[PDB]
Each structure stands twice: as C-alpha cells, then as structure tokens.
Design a protein around this ligand. Structure first.
Ligand SMILES: CN1C(=O)N[C@@]2(O[C@H](CO)[C@@H](O)[C@H](O)[C@H]2O)C1=O
Ligand SMILES: CN1C(=O)N[C@@]2(O[C@H](CO)[C@@H](O)[C@H](O)[C@H]2O)C1=O
Ligand SMILES: *Cc1c(COP(=O)(O)O)cnc(C)c1O
Ligand SMILES: *Cc1c(COP(=O)(O)O)cnc(C)c1O
Lengths: 830, 830
C-alpha cells in the first residue's frame, strides 16, 4: 500500500477490538447510531492508547537518568491535527488503514473530522510545533510550555469578498489527546505591591490566579520517545474570588470568576505586530510564572533532592536546565527567574544573575519596528511592581558595563538602555532578552547578519560571542511523509527510508535526475496531487478549476511586507495582456492566494477584498476562458496547507528583501516538488544556494539595492511614469474597473501604493513579471521543469528541523542529540 | 462480609485488571506516582464500565417497545456521591471491596474522595434524586431533565462563628459519570419581538444561546435498568456572538461569550424563598425550551415517525408523554408547549390546549408566600414576549370559565387571575400551573388538605378533580443499605433481602420487638454508628464528644419556620438548669445542629452565630462537664447526612404546625433507628399515624391552635411574662451573656422574638421542654428506648419513594410500575 508500516495479522485484529471497546465503553454508542465523528473518536482513542505506555516510560526514564532538560517557552504552538501524525510516528498508519477498512470505514474520511489545534498565528507558532517533533525525534529531554487557549486563531469566512472572523471553538467536542493534570495546579500572582523589610523585598497583597496544566504527548519518529507539551489553563481560586467579603453579591462573585479565567480564553491574532494590551501582558507573565515553578520543582528533585553536594546550590542549575525564549513573548522569564532566586531562595544578586544568563537563550524572529515589544512602564508598574524594580536594576548594572566598555559614549548609553524615554516610558523587551541570555540567534543567515549590522549592532560590539544563527527548518514527517505519501514512496523506492530522519540523504536523488522512470514518476505524483486538490476544491468549496494549468500559489498570512499586492499586479497584468491579444497562446495558470488578516489590520483586509475582486472579473470573462483563474483559498491553516503545498507548481516568496526573517512555507514547497519564484530574502538565499541559482527563479532588489533606494528616496511616481502596463493597472483600480458599484473602493490601496509604500512594490514590478515569463517558458517543457524540480527536492535536506535542532542542542543548549530507540513500549507495571 | 453481594472468583480478578487498565490507559499514571485520588478514579471508571452495557440496552429497549415516557423537569437534582450507590444497585460492593483490598487499598478511603453532586438546595432537590432512583427501580421509561450548574450549592465555612460561603467547584477534577453529548446541542431563544403575519405570529430577532446536553446514568436496584438524567449546559453560538459586526473589538467579542454561558454557571442558593432575578428566569426558560425540543423530537420518531395514522397528529402526544413540574420553576413549559404547537406545528388553540393540559402535571411544595413565584410582567415582556401573549390568552379563556361557573362573583375573578395587579403587575406562576395541568398535588396529607382549604381553595371549587396528594418518601437504597449496612444486615438476617425494593416488609420486624437478640443487635449497630461518627468528628473537624450521651440532632436548611431557635431555647434551658443544681443527675446529650443559610438571609445567618455562641459558653463550662455539648455541624450536605442520620438518637422536626409541607429528613431518621420529637406538621402526622402516637414524641400547637392564636393575635410578651425560665434566657441574650465582647450582638433575634415572630416560637416552648423531659426519661431505659425504635423502623415502610412513585405512576402518569429484571447486561454489538 506504501511504507506506512506493516499491516500485521495480530495487530489489525488487536486494533479492531480496541476500536470497538472505545466505541462502546468510551463513547457509549452502538454501531446503529454511531456517526463518522464517533468513529473518528473511537480510532483516536485507540491510537492514543499505543503511546501512553511509551509516554510513561519516557518520562520515568528522564527521571532515572536525569539529563539536562530543555524548556521551550512559547506563546504559540501551531499543532494542527494529530491523529495521522501519531500513526506515522508510531508506524501504525497501514495497520489502522487496514483495520478500519475491515470495519467498513474510510480512514481518510475520519481524519478530516479532526479539528485543527490552531494555537498559533503562522510561522512562529508552526516553528515551535516542528521543533517539538524534532526534539522528540532526536531524543532530547525537551518540554514545550505554553497556554491552552480555548479559542485559537479565528476561522476565516469570506462574505461578499470580505473576511469575516468567527470564534474557533476547537474544544467543542473535546480533545482526546490532552490529559488534564489538576493535581499539579500552581498559583500565579498579579498586582500587589513591594515591601522592603529587613532581609529582602516582599511581593505583597497580590491577586492570585491558578494555572492548571494539560499535557499533550509529542512522539518522536519511530524511536519510542514521547515527550510532553504542557499547556496552562487559567482558573480562579475559590476563596478570595468569593471570600473578599462585605457586600457585592454572592451570585455576582461567582460569575466574576470569569475574569481571572479570561487570561487563557483567546489567542491574540497578531502576526508580526505588537499590541500593548494588558490581557496580553497577563498571558505573558502567566505562562512564565507557572512554567518556572514547574522547572524549579523538577530541579529540586533531580539528584540534588537526594544528595549531591547537599545544600540547594543553584550553581548546577544551568547544567540541568536550559530555557529557550521563542521571541520576546516569554521575556519576563528573565526578571522572574531573578525574583525567585533573589527574593525567595535568597541568592546574592550576582550569583543569581550568573545563573540566569547561563540558562536563558533568546531567538529573534523579525526586524520590523511595529513587531517589537515595548511595554509601557505604567503597565508593568501596576501589574508587576517587583519585576519592574528588577528590570531597572538589571538595566543599571548593564549600562554600567557599557559605560566601562565605551567611556564617554553617551549616545550609545541611551540607545542600549532597556528603558526608552519619550512620550511614555517603555521597556524594550528585546534589549532585556539580549542582556539576560548567553545566546541570541537569528532564524536565517541574512537575518542574523542584519541583527549584527543593524538592529542590535551596539549589543554585538559589546558581546560578539552571544550572537549566532540557526536557520529554520521544517519536519519531513508532517511536511512530506504525512501530506505527500506518494512522493515519499517513490523516493523510498530508490533510496530507502532512512532519509525521513536524515533528510540530507535526499541528495542521492541527484543521480536519478536523468532517470527516465523517476522523472515520469515525480511528474505523476504531482499530477495526482493536483487532481486530488482540484477535487477537494469542488467538494468543500465549489466552482471548478483546471488541473492542467500551472498551480501558482502564495499562501501565508496577509501582510504588506509579504507583498500579496505585487502578486495581484502580476495577475492583472496577465489579464490585460490576454484581453489585448485574445487569440495568442499563453501557459494556463490557476493562481491561488490564501491567508488570514489580523482583525484590526485594515490594509490587509482591503487586500483580501482586492484579490476576490480581481477573481470576480477574471473568472467570468469569456475571452479568458480556462487560461486564467484567480482563487482565494479560504481559512488557510495547517490542515489546509497539507493539501495545497503538495499540489503546487509555483511557490511565491516575494517579500521585500530584508523583511522576511526566514520563512518556512518556502521550505515546505521546495521539498514537495514546486519551483520557487522569489527575492533574495530570508532563507530563500540559502535555498537557492543549496539548489543552485540556475534552479531557482530569483528576481528583484537585494538588501543593498533597497538601502540605496532609501538613501535616494523612494518615489513610486517615477515607476508609474515609465511603465505603461503598470500605469494601466493603477488607473483600472482608480476608476472602478474592479469595483463597479463602489468605484472608489480601492482608493486606500492606490493612495498607499503611490505615496506611502514602505515595501516598494513598484520597484520590483518589472523584474517580477519578466521573471514570471521565464517560469511560463520552462513550464512549457514538462521534462525540464520536472528535472529542475528534482534538483530542488534532492537538495532540500538542509531545511529539516532535525538539523536546526541538532545545532541548537550543540551550540546553545549543550546537549547531544541521539537517534537511539528507547527500550520498546513493552507493558510493565512497577 | 454483609450482603453487599457476592465476591466471586472470576469477577474480583476481572475487576482488578480493569482497575489497572484505567490507572494506566485512562489516568496515565503508574503505581509509583498514583495518589488516593487517582485510585478513586480508576475504580470509578471501572464501575462505570459495568453500567454502560445496561445503559445502552435500556435506552434501545425503550426505542423498540416505545412505552409512555415520563419527563421529570426540575431545576434541582441533589445527587450527592454516586460511586457506592452504583456498586449497591449493581450488586458490586463486596466484589469491589475484595478486589481493591487485594490491590492493597481501602475502598472506604477512596469513596471519601468523591465530590458531592450538589446541584440542589435541600428537600426539593433531594426529592428529585430519590424519585429518579425509584423510577429506575420500578422500570419506568423516565428521564430527569435539569441544568448542569458548574457551581452547585456553596460550601459552608464557619469563621469566628459566622458562615462563610465559598464556590463549590465540583468539576475541578472532572466527573467520570457524565457523558457530554455535543452532537445533540439545541438552540434556545431570548428577547426579540413578535410579528403577526397573515397565517400566525412569529417570534423574531431573538438572541440565541445553545444548550449542550450531558447524560448521567441512573441505575435501578438490581434490575438491569439504567435510565438517563439529562443536564443542559449553556454555550454561545460562534456566529452572532462574534458576527454581529461594526466595531467593538474581536477580543472583546470572544470574551463576551461568557454572558450567554453564565446561564448555567451557578445554582441560586435559595430554599423556600423567591428572588425575582433575570438570570433565574433565564435559567428557567433555558431548561424548559431545550427539554421540550428533545421531548417532541423523540415523539416525532416513536412509531408515528414510521406510520400510525400518518399525519403528525399530536392527539396521541398525551398518550406517549407525561411531564411532571417539580414546583413552579419549570412552569414556562406550559406556555412553551402551546407556543410550539400553535406557532410552529400550527394546531388550533383549543386542540393544543387540550394536549397541553393532558400531558402536564404540577407538584406544589410550600405554602409560605415569600416562596411563591410571581414574575414581574415587564421582565417577561422583555425576555419572552410571545410567552407573555400566550399567558394573557390562557388567562382570558380561564377567567371566562370561572365567570361562567360563578356568575357575578367579581372578587373571585381577580383572586384567581394569573395576572396580579398592583405596584407592579406580576404573573402568578402557581395559578398558571393549576390551569394548564390535569393534576395538582401536595407532598403530605395535611399539606394537600391545606391547599384545598386555603391557598388554592377557589381553584379546588372550580375543578375538584385536579387536586390530589402524594406523600413524599425516600429511597431505602441510599438512605438505609448504603449509609447503614450494619442495620440493613441484621434486618436481612431475620426477614431477608426482599424489603430493599419492598419496604412494607419491614412490618415483619414487629414480631421481633420482644426478641432479646434483636433488641441487643439493633442497639449494637446504633452504638457502632455513634462511635464511627464521634471518630469522624475528631478526624476531619477536631475537638471531642462523648458517644454515650444522647445524640440530639437537627439537620436541615436554616429557616425561621424550621425553628432552630426553638431548639436553641431548649439547649440554653438545659444549661441553666445544670448551673442551678450542678450535682443533680441529668441524661447527657450532644446536641448537633447543622444546616446552610442562604447568603442573603440575614436572620438565618444570625441564628448560626447564635448556635456557635451557645457552644462557646456551654462547651467550656467546667461545671457542665461532659453532660452537655453544643456542636454546629459544618457544611451539611447529602454525604454528611449519610453519616449523622445513622448515628442519631433523637430527630428534631419542630417546624410550626402548617409550615413544613412534608419534610423528608424526618423519614431518613425514622428508618435509621432514631426517635422523633416534633409537631403535627407535614409528614410527621403520617409517621406518628403509622408507628402509633405512643411511639412518637409529639408536642405543641396543631394547625387549628395556630389559627385560633392568629384570630386572637399573637403576643409574645404574655409568654415572656408567665415563664421565668423563658424570661431568664431572653435577658441572657439581651445582656451579652452569650456575646461578651459585643453585648448587643443578638438584639435582632430578641427584637424579632418579642415583636415579629411569624412562627410563634414562644407559644411552643413550654410543651417542648416538657416533652424533651419525657425523651430523657425513656433514654434512661435502654431496653424500652430500643423497643420503641424497633416500632418506628418496622413501621417506616410507607415512606419509601417506591410507594410514592408507584402512586404517581398510576394516579397521574397512567403507567404501570414493574419489578421485572431487564434481560441481563450481556455484551451484544449489533
Ligand atoms: C510572525 N512571525 C514572526 O514574527 N516572525 C516569523 O517567524 C518565522 C519563524 O521564525 C519566520 O520564518 C518568519 O519569516 C517570521 O516572519 C513569523 O512568522
Ligand atoms: C425548599 N423546599 C420547598 O420549597 N419545599 C420543600 O420540598 C420538600 C419535598 O417536597 C418537602 O419535604 C419540604 O417540606 C418543603 O419545604 C423544600 O425542601
Ligand atoms: C508554514 C506555515 C506558515 C508560515 O508561512 P510563511 O510562508 O513562512 O509566512 C504559516 N501558516 C501556516 C498554516 C503554515 O503551515
Ligand atoms: C433529606 C435532606 C434535606 C431535607 O431535610 P428536611 O429535614 O426535610 O428539611 C435537606 N438537606 C439534605 C442534605 C438532605 O439529605
């Protein structure tokens, strides 16, 4: 059937009876009233059974051996569905497929019922998920720590061409993967004040919110290792949240509990944008405060909570603990670690600081200013008074370090301060992270260099040793084996299966680049993939596309820097050329644009309306025929990504050079047989470098050109004046060609494009359509297109998150990865 | 070990491995980290497994055979713990006891970990629970319908002698008994307006709240019948509760969902008191609206949703459906049934009314005016506009009936109206229920007569046929076998086990009233019970009592009509007599008073403070010694009741004649070997009638005497003037004898007692202490005390809820009870 494992005789039988046990005993249903949803849960529960045994021995193992622990703190974990992934990592896919078949059910149909774990916005959240999978696969004693939002990223609905947001009640029917652990609930404090008494400061008169943990298993790839993702839920104490007496109402007091519990109710839908709301800041301290107590408790036990030197010496803390800050969101971990060490454990400042810096590491994910976290001091002052004091003290000592290193450099001092003066005083969270971490890293080579040359230049001059790079990657399990079994099978037919956990082996595919059978196969799976997606489209969303055309897709969050608008300009250009010479041949294309716009991002929502507007015109022009279709992919999410990417021919990664830190979607397309048209931005540089620029469609300004233009001054009028095709489009938008009933509908877009384009869309226009012509030319030559594809796939190995994690492990965490199978799952009951 | 069933060889082994399966696979724990709480859940899950098989066949059965269905609507269901009860009804107690023993665990210790299902306030809520057990035991196709409050009755804490309320988070660790059924979620409407168009009225522009059901199994006693208790939970729709656009905030819109969900957040802690709050009214329509849709859906299928006459003829609706209104709380079921039939199904008014009256029945539970539901019209007008219109129309036609029956009786008309004029117009829910039901019943013979003679006199003259009586009862399973296995065993040794489902058989115990061995045994279990409680007291609450003294206990909600104050006067009297003649012998007593006071009931909370105040003085007087102890039983609830009642010697049922509708605690004490001192009120009359007044300690005014006094006019001063002992107590309270630091602390109680005692406490004082002397006299004669006890126990059979339910079934519902074992639980998988 494929190498989705063995469909053993004993195990298919075993699976079937357990499916039945759960349908009866767990679901309390009988075959006569069971619905596909019930069948999905019976299976889910049956699959979950297979990893509890391993989950328990893995955790027990780490307790016995006691290795250095890795704590990945992140406010986002974009998990997606977990049924198939679990079957894949446990070599259960074929067995389950067989058993459910014998039960008369279609596994694929049941898989579609699983709701996505949308606890993320995009890249940052998904990176965290891929990392978790890789850390488990590399046998690292790693723990993912975050918040269990009851409402993840909103589900997007397009009404009249506009995005409509609606709550993502992903828990409505329950989550069979998580395990509530109410017995490990911890208290978290807010507000209050600071008392300075005799031997130390005291955080007093605080409001208490409880953090209840929920554990979700994270299985490694076929190695019997099952790590843990602990997500905190906010709960109100039953005392004070009722007991602070003297009139108000008993009923009201109980109803008001949903005020402390709002902390984990919803994820903020902002991608690369900072919103200084109190609720967010509360979410940030909540996950940090709860997590740290859990980390210290585990440390207190270790082998110190037995003997060792005997005396809670936190000197070995960094040798046993490593906490990674996914961006600045969990940055309060630094002053909080200090607070506990200094205030509670009573360590001297300097010893505490040494420990903190040695256990913390920060990862930066963007260079755009509006994405930077700068919290107003009056907020921190009210909500976390002691942390503010600690931050000021950290700042004090840090700046003294600077003064001593750069005597008299008074401007440097203000520039490096963790405290920003002005309208309102703010705290620069990024500066905090650099100061209290022993390592700071970018997510792509150029991004990392930019940090050193620009944004964090001063910090780099002070401590050059802290700055590193760790190019992002993606997991070949979900992003290849899971979503593209067809491609994985033909690769395995030639080079085996060891590449799933050793992606570098894909290079061996280079020697089949002239193989006639392989070229035919690679081309066949892609065609099969396109047919399946073209079908899904009519199934779930309804209104035809042509599977023979070139599948041109750009899927990622809607942003001005991602330039969906530049993609739009090209689409309209194609349209206008066709209307000019109708009877001239052009390579057919289905351009698919999908992505979510943050609810308050007006421009982003305007762009979505533009895309649908273009489709309204283009898709109903008889002269165009089936040569050009414009489709907006609704509710783009992980599960939807697993469907489009494998069916894509052209991947669009056209952000303005220097704005996309790395990107990961680009990697997903490269490993799944799509060709890339893009700019020398983020990881695109390393991808073209790996496959050879000849096998890549690079265009536009490089970072240097962008800066040259900025020195000069960017004037869009110039481009409007010298390019008639561009002029024609702008006047089409301006006159209502695309919005008849509301002719001025797109005035904001035009206005922006002409007067405040921060991402110089026009500047890359000419080179973009010129380059688009070259991909059309090559698509006309199926054999050469597929051979270039093979050159990309065979060379994508470097972009696996196993590589990334192995580097973090060695160069930052100080641990050694291991592909050693944990001693079976085998029963056992001590 | 006892007749808690057989500890079979095959089944103890089977139980043990399933306990282990769940500890591993369900709890995801290993023996080395498992805590008593984990062990309790493994067991709970193991026990729950045994009844799903029966649960499924019982429900399938009713679907095949299609009998008349009984729907018990109630806003309260005081369930308590369900582990032991399930073991008892499934004959699993000894097997589980053995198996857990072999696993090295103490079952009793694990049982104590189960949280109480406190979804009730007192009598009314517990009656519903006992009924459910009886309906299952009598094989009735019955369904309990209510609300799944996430917070039940508050947990009571005594601080400085005052009651402190704290949220009852009974779901904190989860509920292994319920089964969420999100797939059967239904929509419920609120607000909106009424449109009158061409062919009928339309309820339009409403706000939608979703009702998600949760089913809990209700097993009959050893008959393999497992009925269902469906509890609704409020959920916000993800559309409008987000989709009603045009600024407000996406985050805020999501956080605001907890506004529609507040409907099922908390139970109103009022016992026999009406609070006209909107949230309550919403809770009342919510349970009614959701339930009715479920009822009609089931009816539409039946055997009509196949063939029958073919044409949705609701003429057979009453033949297939019976809905019982537990008090007026679910009274909106009447106008709602009309709304659906008329507005949606399009039946003519008269045919719809005929159906409604024929399927509905109302049970009245109190005669005090402040407990009567009278909803302001402006509330109904805003929240349920169409229901108000329907109610007015029902009123219109009803009054016309009256006018026609009593021509010219203009005062009768206003008195009987469902609409009350005055300050604010109100709707008398009780009048609504009488009009739209074919049967109205009281809960005790005297209570029922009072309804006919007083409160509903006019309604009785109009339709004498509607009024009936159904004396309350309690379940011998929980209230005997479960909480008093010792007594149940010795009874079984003599007369067998058939009495558990045929309590009348207890009469056979009359012939052992002179049996020397029996008297010794009855006396032995009571002593064992007292020793166990005296121990529990020091275990969980700490500060000694004497097991040889007479256990004088009054446990029930704190109310002025229950007269805990009269009990207080006696206690102080005993104290004062001892201080007067210290070296005179008196029968030792431990008087235990326990009960919860509604949060806003000031007097009730003052009485609790008084009780603790008396104990402070009495319990620390050296001259008193161990002859008199005053203890306030904290957090009285079902689970606590199962502990005290079996250990009680004297049961206090001293409400003012004519105020306690029936009472059920009194019955619990009678069947568990306690003697009753009380007034001729509620069921006390029928109990004394059944055991013989010679075996009862009756005192005080009868209803007639109360009325005579009211004609005359009640003047408490008179009693204060003629009884020196009474005078001495009042002046002790007035001067701070019981409250040194705050001498005027009890001015409200004294003031009330002297000037506004609605329950004439003083009037029954003399006859009360005189009577108390007689019980002390008889306690001095162990052999005769025990023989009187035997006379009570042997004669309590009439008070089993099986009797009550059998009567409801025959005289109201029109169904025949059956003690036929359902065809085993046996596997099966169609
Ligand atoms: C939102 N968001 C960011 O703020 N940074 C991001 O992180 C991802 C993983 O590091 C990168 O691939 C993206 O380029 C970057 O924009 C991202 O997706
Ligand atoms: C609160 N509450 C009432 O309103 N009525 C009650 O119902 C019980 C069951 O019918 C009766 O036994 C009580 O006497 C009556 O007070 C009760 O307990
Ligand atoms: C991989 C992924 C992303 C990141 O896409 P980029 O092109 O790097 O912005 C965002 N959303 C989803 C659903 C993803 O799978
Ligand atoms: C039986 C019961 C009641 C009713 O007691 P009465 O004496 O009828 O008021 C109240 N509370 C609990 C916990 C009960 O078990």
């Amino acid at each position: 059937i494929s190498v989705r494992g063995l469909a053993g005789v004993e195990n298919v039988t075993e699976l079937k009876k357990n499916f039945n046990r759960h349908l009866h005993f767990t679901l309390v249903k009988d075959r006569n009233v069971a619905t596909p949803r019930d069948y999905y849960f019976a299976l889910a529960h049956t699959v979950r059974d297979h990893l509890v045994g391993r989950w328990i021995r893995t955790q027990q193992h780490y307790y016995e051996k006691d290795p250095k622990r890795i704590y990945y703190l992140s406010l986002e974990f974009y998990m997606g569905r977990t049924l198939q992934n679990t079957m894949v990592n446990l070599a259960l896919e074929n067995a389950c497929d067989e058993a459910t078949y014998q039960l008369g059910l279609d596994m694929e149909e049941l898989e579609e019922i699983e709701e996505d774990a949308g606890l993320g916005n995009g890249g940052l959240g998904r990176l965290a998920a891929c990392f978790l999978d890789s850390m488990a696969t590399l046998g690292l004693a790693a723990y993912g720590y975050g918040i269990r939002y009851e409402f993840g990223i909103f589900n997007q609905k397009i009404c009249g061409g506009w995005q409509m947001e609606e709550a993502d009640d992903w828990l409505r029917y329950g989550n069979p993967w998580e395990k509530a652990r109410p017995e490990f609930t911890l208290p978290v404090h807010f507000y209050g004040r600071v008392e300075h008494t005799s031997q130390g400061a005291k955080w007093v008169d605080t409001q208490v919110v409880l953090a209840m943990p929920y554990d979700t298993p994270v299985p490694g790839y076929r190695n019997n290792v099952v790590n843990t993702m602990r997500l905190w839920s906010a709960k109100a104490p039953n005392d004070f949240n009722l007991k602070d007496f003297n009139v108000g109402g008993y009923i009201q007091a109980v109803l008001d509990r949903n005020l402390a519990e709002n902390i984990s109710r919803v994820l903020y839908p902002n991608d690369n944008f900072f919103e200084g709301k109190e609720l967010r800041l509360k979410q940030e301290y909540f996950v940090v405060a709860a997590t740290l107590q859990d980390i210290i408790r585990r440390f207190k036990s270790s082998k110190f909570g037995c003997r060792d030197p005997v005396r809670t010496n936190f000197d070995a803390f960094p040798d046993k603990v490593a906490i990674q800050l996914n961006d600045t969101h969990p940055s309060l971990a630094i002053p909080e670690l200090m607070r506990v060490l200094v205030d509670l454990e009573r360590l001297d400042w300097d010893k505490a600081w040494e420990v903190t810096v040695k256990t913390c590491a920060y990862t930066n994910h963007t260079v755009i200013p509006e994405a930077l976290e700068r919290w107003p001091v009056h907020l921190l002052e009210t909500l976390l008074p002691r942390h503010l004091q600690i931050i000021y003290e950290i700042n004090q000592r840090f700046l003294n370090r600077v003064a001593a290193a750069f005597p008299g450099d008074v401007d440097r001092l203000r520039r490096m301060s963790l405290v920003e003066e002005g309208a309102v005083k703010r705290i620069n969270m990024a500066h905090l992270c650099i100061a209290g971490s022993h390592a700071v890293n970018g997510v792509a080579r150029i991004h990392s260099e930019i940090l050193k040359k620009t944004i964090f230049k001063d910090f780099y001059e002070l401590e050059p040793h802290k700055f590193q790079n760790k190019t992002n990657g993606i997991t070949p399990r979900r992003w290849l084996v899971l979503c593209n079994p067809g491609l994985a099978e033909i690769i395995a037919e030639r080079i085996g299966e060891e590449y799933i956990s050793d992606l570098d082996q894909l290079r061996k595919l280079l020697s089949y680049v002239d193989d006639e059978a392989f070229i035919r196969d690679v081309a066949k799976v892609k065609q099969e993939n396109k047919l399946k997606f073209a079908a899904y489209l009519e199934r779930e969303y309804k209104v035809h596309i042509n599977p023979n055309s070139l599948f041109d897709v750009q899927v990622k969050r809607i942003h001005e820097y991602k330039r969906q608008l530049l993609n739009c300009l090209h689409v309209i250009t194609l349209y206008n050329r066709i209307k000019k010479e109708p009877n001239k041949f052009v390579v057919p294309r289905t351009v698919m644009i999908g992505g979510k716009a943050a609810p308050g991002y007006h421009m982003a929502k305007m762009i979505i309306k533009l895309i649908t507007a273009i489709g309204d015109v283009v898709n109903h022009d008889p002269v165009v025929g089936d040569r050009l279709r414009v489709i907006f992919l609704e509710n783009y999410r992980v599960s939807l990504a697993e469907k489009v990417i494998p069916a894509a021919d052209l991947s669009e990664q056209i952000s303005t050079a220097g704005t996309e830190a790395s990107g990961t979607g680009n990697m997903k397309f490269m490993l799944n047989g799509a060709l890339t048209i893009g700019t020398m931005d983020g990881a695109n540089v390393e991808m073209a470098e790996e496959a050879g620029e000849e096998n890549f469609f690079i265009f536009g300004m490089r970072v240097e050109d962008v800066d040259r233009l900025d020195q000069r001054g960017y004037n869009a009028q110039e481009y409007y004046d010298r390019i008639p095709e561009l002029r024609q489009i702008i006047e089409q938008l301006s006159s209502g060609f695309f919005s008849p009933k509301q002719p001025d509908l797109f005035k904001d877009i035009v206005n922006m494009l002409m007067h405040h384009d921060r991402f110089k869309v026009f500047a890359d226009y000419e080179e973009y359509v010129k380059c688009q012509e070259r991909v059309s030319a090559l698509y006309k030559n199926p054999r050469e297109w597929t051979r270039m594809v093979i050159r990309n796939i065979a060379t994508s190995g470097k972009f696996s998150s196993d590589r990334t994690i192995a580097q973090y492990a060695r160069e930052i965490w100080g641990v050694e990865p291991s592909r050693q199978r944990l001693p079976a799952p085998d029963e056992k009951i001590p």
